[PDB]
Amino acid sequence: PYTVVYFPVRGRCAALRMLLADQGQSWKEEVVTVETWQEGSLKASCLYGQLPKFQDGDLTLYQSNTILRHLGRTLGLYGKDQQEAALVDMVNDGVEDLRCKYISLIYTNYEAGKDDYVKALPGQLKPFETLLSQNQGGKTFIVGDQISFADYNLLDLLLIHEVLAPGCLDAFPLLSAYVGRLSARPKLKAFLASPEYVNLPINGNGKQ
Amino acid sequence: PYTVVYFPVRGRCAALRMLLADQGQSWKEEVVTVETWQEGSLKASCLYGQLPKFQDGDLTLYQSNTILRHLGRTLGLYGKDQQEAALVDMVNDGVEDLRCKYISLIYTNYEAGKDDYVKALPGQLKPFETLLSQNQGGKTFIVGDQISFADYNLLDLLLIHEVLAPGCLDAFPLLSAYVGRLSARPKLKAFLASPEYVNLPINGNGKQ
Ligand SMILES: C=C(CC)C(=O)c1ccc(OCC(=O)O)c(Cl)c1Cl
Ligand SMILES: C=C(CC)C(=O)c1ccc(OCC(=O)O)c(Cl)c1Cl
DSSP B77-105: -S-SSHHHHHHHHHHHHHHHHHHHHHHHH
DSSP A58: T
Phi then psi for A28, rounded to 5 degrees? Answer: -110, 140
Question: What gap in Å lies between CA B13 and CA B202, rounded to an integer?
Answer: 10
Q: What is the dihedral of CA A30, A35, A40, A44, to 10 degrees?
A: 20
CA nearest to A203, candidates A173, A140, A161: A161
- The distance between the two most distant Cα atoms of chain B, rounded to a whole number of Å, is 51
Separation between Cα atoms, residue A12 and residue A22, nearest integer Å: 17
| Cis amide leading into B8 (omega within 30) | no
Tell me whether residues A73 and B86 touch, CB distance under 8 A. Answer: yes
Give the Cα separation of A4 and A62 in Å (integer): 10
Q: What's the rounded Cα separation, in Å, for the pair B140 and B147?
A: 8
The residues near B82 (Cβ < 8 Å, ≥ 6 apart) are: A70, A73, A74
If you measure from the C-alpha of residue A50 to the centroid of ligand 1, how many angstroms do you get, rounded to a whole number?
Answer: 9
Q: Give the distance (Å) from ligand 2 centre to CA of residue B106.
A: 10
- Ligand 1 center to A192 CA (angstroms): 21
Which residues in chain B have their CB less than 8 angstroms from residue A157's CB? none
For residues A49 and A69, what is the distance between their CA atoms, to the nearest angstrom? 20
**Nearest by Cα to A5 from A38, A27, A35, A21:** A27
Ligand 2 neighbourhood includes B54 CB (under 6 angstroms): no
Are A128 and A94 a contacting pair, CB within 8 Å? yes
Of A163, A207, A166, A158, the closest CA to residue A182 belongs to: A158
Helix, strand or coil, per DSSP, at residue B141: coil
Annotate B23-55 with b (16+ C-beta within 10 A) or e (fewer).
eeeeeeeeebeeeeeeeeeeeeebbbeebbbbb
Q: Which CATH fold topology does B1-77+186-207 show?
A: Glutaredoxin (3.40.30)
Question: What SS3 state is found at A5?
Answer: strand
Please give the residue of chain B at the shortest CA–CA distance from A87: B61
Q: How far is B202 from chain A (nearest CA, A)?
A: 22
Q: Which amino acid is at A8?
A: P
For the B78-185 domain, the top CATH level (class) is mainly alpha
Strand partners, B3: B28, B55
Name every chain B residue with its beta carbon within 8 A of the beta carbon of A48.
94, 97, 127
Alpha helices in chain B (DSSP H): 14-22, 34-39, 41-45, 64-74, 82-108, 110-133, 149-164, 173-183, 186-193, 195-198
- Spatial neighbors of A15 by CB under 8 A, at least 6 apart, are A64, A68, A149, A152, A153, A155, A156
- Domain boundaries, given as residue ranges, for chain B: 1-77+186-207, 78-185
Distance CA A118, CA A114 (A): 6
Q: Which residues contact A53 (CB under 8 A, 6 or more apart)?
A: A4, A5, A6, A46, A60, A61, A62
Q: Which amino acid is at B117?
A: Y
Which residue has a Cα nearest atom 16 of ligand 2?
B204
Other Cβ atoms within 10 Å of A95 Cβ, number: 25
Which ligand sits closest to the CA of A51? 1
Residue B166: CB partners within 8 Å, gap ≥ 6? none
Q: Cα separations (Å) of B176 from B108, B126, B149?
A: 29, 12, 19
CA distance A30 to A48: 18
C-alpha count within 13 angstroms, C-beta hemisphere, residue A76: 4
- Which ligand 1 atom sits nearest the alpha carbon of residue A100? 14
- What lies within 8 Å, CB to CB, of A109 at 6+ separation is none
Query: Cα(A163)–Cα(B160) distance, rounded to whole angstroms?
Result: 40
Q: Cβ(B59)–Cβ(A89) under 8 Å? A: no
Would residue B68 be called left, alpha or beta, if left means φ above 0 and alpha means ψ between -120 and 50 degrees? alpha
Q: Radius of gyration (Cα) for chain A, nearest Å?
A: 17
Is the Cβ atom of B204 under 6 angstroms away from ligand 2? yes
> Which chain B residues are closer than 8 Å to A94 by Cβ?
47-48, 63
Alpha-carbon distance of A206 to B170, in angstroms, equals 43
- Structure method: X-ray
Task: Provide CB contacts within 8 A for A31, sequence distance 6+.
Answer: A6, A7, A8
Q: How far is CA A97 from CA A101, A123, A157, B65, in A?
A: 7, 13, 11, 12
